[PDB]
Amino acid sequence: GSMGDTRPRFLWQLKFECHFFNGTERVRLLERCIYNQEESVRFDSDVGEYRAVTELGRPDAEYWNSQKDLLEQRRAAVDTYCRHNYGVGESFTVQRRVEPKVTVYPSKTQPLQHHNLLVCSVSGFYPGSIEVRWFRNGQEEKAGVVSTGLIQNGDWTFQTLVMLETVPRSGEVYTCQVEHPSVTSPLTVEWRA
Amino acid sequence: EEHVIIQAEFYLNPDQSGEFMFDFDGDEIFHVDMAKKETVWRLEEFGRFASFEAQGALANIAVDKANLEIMTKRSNYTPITNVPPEVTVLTNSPVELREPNVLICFIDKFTPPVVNVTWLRNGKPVTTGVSETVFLPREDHLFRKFHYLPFLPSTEDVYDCRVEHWGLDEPLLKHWEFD
């Protein structure tokens, strides 16, 4: 065991999820009650009443569905809760755009003789939607590309790293190109062979 | 486009630990500090753009606590099954000697939301300037958490993030060294 106090634990979680499609043109509210790791009951605005998910949630669905004022408030919450909160934060969440910092360098490991392993690091950006590609002269490279995938840093930024094994030749230029919603022209950083 | 806002709360016994937070597309907007009874914004500027009355979170948590006691009895005292975390260490950006950077310890896919995280520098605990997030929600109803350590990179220093959790037999140690 890696820590003490092994008494049994009991966990209760509530999640109220507001799902938005095309701005606020379509909104779905999903309320979920979860005991330990098991969802027991939910309110789905597309259904319009509480439903038990497991046997443990049946008494709650029955009780809550018998309260008319409760159901009316819940059915109106896509307006009074979801669309309201969407509006509160839109300018600094939905509209947040932070430009990536892009650097290129050769890896400290050069695992193959006569080859050059190049690294493109893309950091500090928001939102997560991004494309990071390598080009050789004017041609996009699709063999020997390795992407670490998208990493969320926990602080409203992301990073990613994309590596290319190359056989550099005279007159070749390698470019890391980044497409991201914060810029209207792609960012590019070149390594000259 | 698609976006999701989640109000996520929990209560855990016997720890008497509660949490209340809002999440946007997987990032925390704010949480309520239960001891200080105050709204804590994830980025400081958010508090100049928006507000949240922290007493409402406290009222919710009191109901959550009462309901946990109901569910504990209704389930015939069925406790949670521990699920240990997966741990990753990375830096905020490529590291350069003597240019300040930040080590990130990402603790993922675990429950219950109790975890002990220690940064070690050359095998010794470091606390200078560390910070951490609260427990963040996942769609499988497990949790995520981040711990941060600012540092001045050196060729002489090595780092480890040590993670302990009721689901782990031995502590997990994840290493970072200047390349």
Binding site: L14, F16, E31, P59, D60, E62, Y63, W64, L70, A77, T80, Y81, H84, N85, G87, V88, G89 | Q7, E9, F22, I29, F30, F49, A50, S51, F52, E53, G56, A57, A59, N60, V63, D64, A66, N67, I70, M71
Partner: peptide, 13 residues
Amino acid sequence: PKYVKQNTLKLAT
């Protein structure tokens, strides 16, 4: 601009 929370309901007893 103020965030609004959803209230948590008492379970059946």
